[PDB]
Each structure stands twice: as C-alpha cells, then as structure tokens.
C-alpha cells in the first residue's frame, strides 16, 4: 500500500508558470485524500462530479495533477466555462470536467522584495485554448498583417508577461498555487484507490 506522491505536487519547492503548467500522472497507489480535504490551508477547494469527503472510498484508473501559479484574482478562472486571459490563453478546463481545483495563497513562497519575475503568463493568442491545451511557444505575436521578423515593435508584441510578485501587493495580486486533480475512470483495473 505505497502512498500516492501528492506531496511531490502540493509541496514542491517551485511551481510552474501557468502558461507552462506542469502535469504529473498518479497511478498504482493508495491516495489519502483526507490530508487534502481536512487541511485548513486551502482557500479554494471546488470539485465537479466528485464529493471531496467521499474520495477515500473511490478507485480510479488514473489521477492527473496539474500544478501552476497564478494571480489571486485569477483563481476564479480555473473552472469550467470561465473566460479571461488565464482560461482563454493559459489553462482551460473542459465543460464536463471531473475533478477538483485546489488553490492557496503562496505570497510567503513566490513573492520576492523587488519582484519575482520567474512566473509568467501568456497575454494573447489568435484563438482560445482547447481543454487541457498547452502553449509554451515564445514566438512574437503578430497583431497586424505587417510581419514580425524576431523584432518586437508596433503590433509585434512578446506574448509572455511576468507577474513580478512582490510581498506588498494586494491579496488579489499575490501569488496563488493551484493544483487541478482530474480523475480518469476507464473500464480497466483501477490503480489509484483510497484507504478503503
């Protein structure tokens, strides 16, 4: 009964940028979901198609943990049917999403006096992301018909912008760590099970 390594996800030293969000596959283990839903530190814990307290009684084929860091007032965008820069261009959940979204304030970890510029988000795309799509392209965004040739300028914008988290920012602008758990259930032997 080897424990599922949820600590590797939730307790990692650094999280990924939302545009380059990270995914870890959890399989062949027993997951203690209680340590998640009985924790007081999560300011966002919202599940779809799943009851959080019941999770210790369910088995699944796989679990997928997507982790990233966003702005506080952008936490609302990590949900089905939402719009905005994060949902449109960075991380998109499907309408039929089956799983939980967990988020907590990480100002003490991801903010630096003078600004932490390691966390980025994508500003614009020609089209919205499809569910679970990932765009890590750093190509210059061509806003007009005049081409860009590796040169930023008028209607030629670099597509990634740094959050620049500072400890003195307002709570809506402070960093938040987000983990999205997706529960895959196929007609196959289940590999991720609760303690019961």
């Amino acid at each position: 009964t080897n424990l599922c390594p949820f600590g590797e996800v939730f307790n990692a030293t650094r999280f990924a940028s939302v545009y380059a969000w990270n995914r870890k596959r959890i399989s062949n283990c027993v997951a203690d979901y209680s340590v998640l839903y009985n924790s007081a530190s999560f300011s966002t814990f919202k599940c779809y198609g799943v009851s959080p307290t019941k999770l210790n009684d369910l088995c699944f084929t796989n679990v997928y943990a997507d982790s990233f860091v966003i702005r506080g007032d952008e936490v609302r965008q990590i949900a089905p049917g939402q719009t905005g820069k994060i949902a449109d261009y960075n991380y998109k959940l499907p309408d039929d999403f089956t799983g939980c979204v967990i988020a907590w304030n990480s100002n003490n970890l991801d903010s630096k006096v003078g600004g932490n510029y390691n966390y980025l988000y994508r500003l614009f795309r020609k089209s919205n992301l499809k569910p679970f799509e990932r765009d890590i392209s750093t190509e210059i965004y061509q806003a007009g018909s005049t081409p860009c040739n590796g040169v930023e300028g008028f209607n030629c914008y670099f597509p990634l912008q740094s959050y620049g988290f500072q400890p003195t920012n307002g709570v809506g602008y402070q960093p938040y760590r987000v983990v999205v758990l997706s529960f895959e259930l196929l007609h196959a032997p289940a590999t991720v099970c609760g303690p019961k």
Partner: antibody
Amino acid sequence: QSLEESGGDLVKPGASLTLTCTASGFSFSGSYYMCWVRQAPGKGLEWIACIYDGSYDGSSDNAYYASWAKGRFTISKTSSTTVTLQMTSLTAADTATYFCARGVYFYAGHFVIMRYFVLWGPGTLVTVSS
Amino acid sequence: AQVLTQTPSSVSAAVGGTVSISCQSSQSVYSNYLSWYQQKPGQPPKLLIYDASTLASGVPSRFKGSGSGTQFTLTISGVQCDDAATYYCQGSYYSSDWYPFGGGTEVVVKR
C-alpha cells in the same frame, strides 16, 4: 523495449486476418497505448487504431479507430504482452506492412490524445491476393 | 477534416548542407503536438522530434524542429550520407481518432 509484429500472411480477398503485437522485455501496466500504423508498398503511413494497454485481458474497450477502419478493424489486449488487430473484409487496398507502435498519450477529459509514437516494431506484411 | 501538407516531395544537399522540410496543417495542432519521423529502407519509422521541437533520445542534434500553430519545419543542419531516407510529419489534434501523417519527403545526398 522491443515490439515484434506477427501474423502477416497472404490472404484471399474477403478473408479475415488477426495480427499480433508481442512485447519483449516489458509488460503492459497502463503507461501507454498500443497503436497500429500501416504502410502500403511504396506509400506513406496511415494510422489505424490504439488501445489502452492497461485494459483487461481479452477486452476491446478503451480503443480508438480511424473512421475508415472503425468496425472492420478490431484492436484488443489479450495478455500482459500481446495486443491483436483483427481485420475483416480484406481487399487489395489493405495490402501493407502493419506496424505496432507505443503511443504516448495525453489525458484530455473524456478521451486521450496520442502525443507521439516512440517505439515501432519491424512490421509484418499482409498480402491480400488470390 | 484535418490534413497535413508536407512539401516538397524531395530535397537535396551536399554533406554539410541544410535541407528544410515543411509541414502545413489546415488546422492548428493541439498543444503543437507535431512530430517528425525518419524511415530508412526496410526499416520501421523512427521518431526524431516530438512536441514540434523536442529532440528524441539518441537523435543527433543536427535534426531540428521548429514552428507553431499550422506551420512547422524540419531542418537537417549538416546533412550526412546516412540521412538519405524518407521523412514524415505527424500531427495530433483535439480529437481521439485522427492522427494524419504527411505525404513524406525524400532526402537525396548530393555528390
């Protein structure tokens, strides 16, 4: 680390044939999808089907098919080291070398998306002729 | 409904030259899941690049992938004699049952 196709044979038009993909040096444990890609002599590559290798023994569930191949082709996991592809109603257009490939999958909700094909077997040749 | 156009059917360069192979998709490729494969005669396809730029293990760095969206390119900077083979692009989309391959491109080593 190795995949070996077998069962490719000379068959008459209208007949059925079942090909086998045998895994060597490892066993299926739910980490990949097993896929079939064919290539007519002198032509390009055409994807046929995939199946989750964590499926139950003898199951055809968790499978995806190209629209042209759906129903006429059946992919199954028969053991921890074998995946089969059953093809029916064969014609000369089905003459090809059939490759078995590991599919690296990406979970996308109610379905998975094949990211790429890493490991290809040498292939087995199917000749549909009288 | 999703077609990959691979041009041209044949490229050539001397030893040390650069050949460019284009792959155009009628629709944006999901998460830029564009991969390139090398097939030498009598051999199965061999993966060269995945995610449109990531080099597969053991593949020489002279093979380079680039592009995003609907336009992608395979570049062999420093063509060698054993690069004479057929190359294919393959795209993945927001779909569970369509993985088109490109028409293929032959690389001819000029001498």
